[PDB]
Design a binder for these strands. Structure first.
Ligand SMILES: [Mg+2]
Ligand SMILES: [Mg+2]
Ligand SMILES: [Mg+2]
Ligand SMILES: [Mg+2]
Lengths: 157, 256, 158
RNA sequence: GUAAUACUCACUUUAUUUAAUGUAUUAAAGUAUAACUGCGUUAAAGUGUAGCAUAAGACUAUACAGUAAGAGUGAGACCUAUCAGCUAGUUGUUAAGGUAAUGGCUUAACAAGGCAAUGACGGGUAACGGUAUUACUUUGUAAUAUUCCGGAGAAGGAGCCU
């Protein structure tokens, strides 16, 4: 029905059944939206859109259980995958100083956020069950890159 | 290790069994039952160590096969039967009855009670839903199912089992300002008055006006009010004085 | 025979891996059972801790549901029209999950719609399977109606 | 044997199986082979043909607790630059098969991804990991086959029945 995602099977959702001869608005009011944890809202693009994804947590099957982490994006080249860089500090007991370590975690990107998220801004994720060989978490919310000091003209004031 | 384990070791035995870590090597691994792994004890240790009725393995079979031992109103002849928390065991001869709960120093005790208390039993609800053909059900801690009860009993309230007709008789609801009993955690055997109920813990008050916080799963309310006192209390009443006052009673208090 | 372990694959960085233990019985597999069309045949399986499974080697007279009138009736299975992942199954006539077929319209009592009328003059109608044949042991599905018929018929052989 | 997938700690399993235990729900005439009796066989080890031969047996289903086990995520851990580039089921998307179950775990089609001086990829070990417990100490080091918990193997490799 929508050609944003190329299909090899009929794009319907699980458990949501209706009469076959159905209008566009009758199809639109029957999309099931999942429930979330506290502190998180479903986005505006999760409701008005028409896509069907198996792995997106809004209008999907995967339930998020467990901890919640954070990071900075590193790459956005492939499809529905982004690489989140996590920084932390370890403590050495002999020299009594700190070191810097880093990890890379590939996480699943929902089709709701399309033109918003760029390179170099924070993402709040959540851990789920396993989804691939290397994919285990899901993007939930984002914030823009901070603008502390930049050239501001008089119209920027 | 392709299957289950059947041998237990004396060094990893629970310390609340009051066993000696001397000459023995193995200990009795008890059967699966209604209680958990922590609140259960084997029966053969009760007739040997805590109660003193037998000396060796032969005299254990004599009392058990004579069918006088009555746990929760049922005769039992297996030495591996687990005696849990809160159950009442009795002998048919000599009219001796006991209630089983912890002492003050995280050890098992046995307290002689009366025949008016020998009838009933207390337990705590954990879960409730409606089963097949529109019949309500209430599930307790030990795994008994009960139907057609009062609708005022909620998920966390306690019940009173008659133990002979197996019918729910009385219940005590869950609220603040109730007397409480604890059975797990780092603090066991404390008896307290509820002050503040949080979503996961409870803020309580001892009889010595102290304070402690404890998760909701580890407690059981025994009475709604101080004047209720549905069961009989232990002799110490679970006060568990600190090491400071234990250092104060030995040498006197510090004069200032 | 066929394992489902993960200890043999390469790392995330691309370096080789090394094993330290033999093959376990916990992760144990089987071969593919391709369900054909013919005279009916069902064999039984034994799974872990009882729990018998049924596999079907040759299947016939699958059950289907009419969506508009909401009744269920049996029909025969004639041909396969489309299979999503591998296009060679249509020449060997194997039935798996989500593969559309061609069924007889004898016992079916249809309503009067514009699209189904021309095929209802002949004996044939269309249906799509929705159950795992090799593990449940029997096929069930839905009859194509409406815009769902508009989607699959662009993918036909023509 | 394994430098980490093994081990320790903190989390998840609505993604899963469990004989013996506890409390509950449900259902309820016909058909073989042994031991026995009797004829035998081969150096040994074992095995055969009869007596329509003849006994006991075999032809309910599920819940919720309770024990036991499987599967995931993250963090920690020896020496080496006279080892600086490495990887092609390798990284991802769709679909199916298979398992008690998540998952390139396996297979079709398409795409070009994935990791690195915060040390990738290689080489060595006279390398089973923690722990109870010993020493020496001014923010902590060193030993720990030895008590206990956990993992792997039965001359070397592979395959399978109950
Ligand atoms: Mg015979
Ligand atoms: Mg391929
Ligand atoms: Mg060691
Ligand atoms: Mg040898």
């Amino acid at each position: 029905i929508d050609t944003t995602l190329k299909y090899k099977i009929f794009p319907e959702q699980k458990g949501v059944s209706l009469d076959p001869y159905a209008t566009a608005e009758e199809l639109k009011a029957s999309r099931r939206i999942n429930e979330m944890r506290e502190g998180f809202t479903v986005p505006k693009t999760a409701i008005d859109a028409t896509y069907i994804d198996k792995k997106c947590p809004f209008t999907g099957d995967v339930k998020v259980t467990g901890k919640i982490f954070e990071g900075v994006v590193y790459k956005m080249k492939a499809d529905k995958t982004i690489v989140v860089r996590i920084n932390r500090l370890v403590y050495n007991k002999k020299y009594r100083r700190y070191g810097r370590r880093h990890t890379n975690v590939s996480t699943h990107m929902s089709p709701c956020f399309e033109g918003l998220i760029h390179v170099g801004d924070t993402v709040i994720c959540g851990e789920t069950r396993r989804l691939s060989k290397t994919k285990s978490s899901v993007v939930l919310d984002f914030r823009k890159k901070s603008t502390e000091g930049n050239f501001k003209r008089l119209e920027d004031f | 290790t392709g299957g289950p384990r059947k041998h237990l070791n004396r060094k990893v035995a629970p310390t609340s069994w009051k066993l000696d870590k001397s000459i023995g090597t193995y200990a009795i691994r008890p059967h699966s039952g209604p209680h958990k792994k922590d609140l259960c004890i084997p029966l053969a240790y009760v007739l040997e160590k805590f109660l003193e009725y037998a000396n060796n393995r032969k005299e254990i079979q004599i009392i058990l096969k004579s069918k006088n031992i009555k746990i929760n109103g049922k005769i039992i002849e297996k030495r591996k039967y687990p005696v849990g928390f809160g159950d009442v065991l009795s002998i048919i001869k000599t009219d001796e009855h006991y209630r089983v709960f912890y002492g003050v120093d995280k050890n098992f005790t046995f307290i002689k009670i009366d025949k008016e208390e020998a009838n009933f039993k207390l337990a705590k609800v954990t879960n409730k839903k409606v089963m097949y053909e529109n019949v309500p059900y209430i599930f307790t801690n030990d795994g008994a199912c009960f139907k057609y009860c009062d609708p005022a009993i909620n998920i966390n309230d306690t019940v009173k089992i008659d133990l002979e007709t197996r019918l729910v008789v009385d219940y005590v609801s869950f609220k603040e300002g109730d007397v409480v009993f604890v059975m797990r955690g780092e603090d066991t055997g404390r008896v307290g008055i509820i002050k503040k109920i949080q979503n996961t813990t409870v803020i309580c008050e001892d009889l010595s006006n102290k304070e402690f916080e404890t998760s909701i799963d580890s407690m059981i309310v025994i009475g709604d009010n101080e004047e209720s006192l549905l069961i009989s209390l232990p002799e110490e009443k679970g006060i568990r004085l600190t090491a400071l006052e234990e250092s104060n009673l030995k040498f006197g208090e510090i004069v200032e | 025979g066929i394992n489902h372990r993960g200890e043999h694959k390469r790392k995330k960085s691309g370096g080789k891996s090394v094993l330290h233990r033999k093959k376990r019985n916990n992760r144990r597999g089987s071969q593919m059972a391709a369900t054909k069309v013919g005279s009916t045949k069902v064999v039984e399986k034994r799974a872990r801790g009882g729990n018998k499974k049924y596999k079907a080697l040759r299947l016939n007279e699958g059950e289907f549901l009419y969506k508009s009138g909401n009744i269920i009736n049996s029909s025969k299975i004639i041909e396969v029209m489309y299979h999503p992942t591998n296009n060679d199954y249509v020449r060997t006539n194997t039935i798996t999950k989500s593969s559309v077929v061609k069924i007889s319209s004898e016992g079916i009592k249809i309503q009067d719609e514009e699209d189904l009328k021309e095929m209802y003059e002949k004996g044939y109608l269309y249906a799509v399977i929705n159950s795992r044949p090799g593990q449940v042991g029997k096929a069930e599905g839905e009859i194509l109606q409406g815009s769902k018929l508009e989607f699959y018929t662009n993918l036909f052989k023509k």
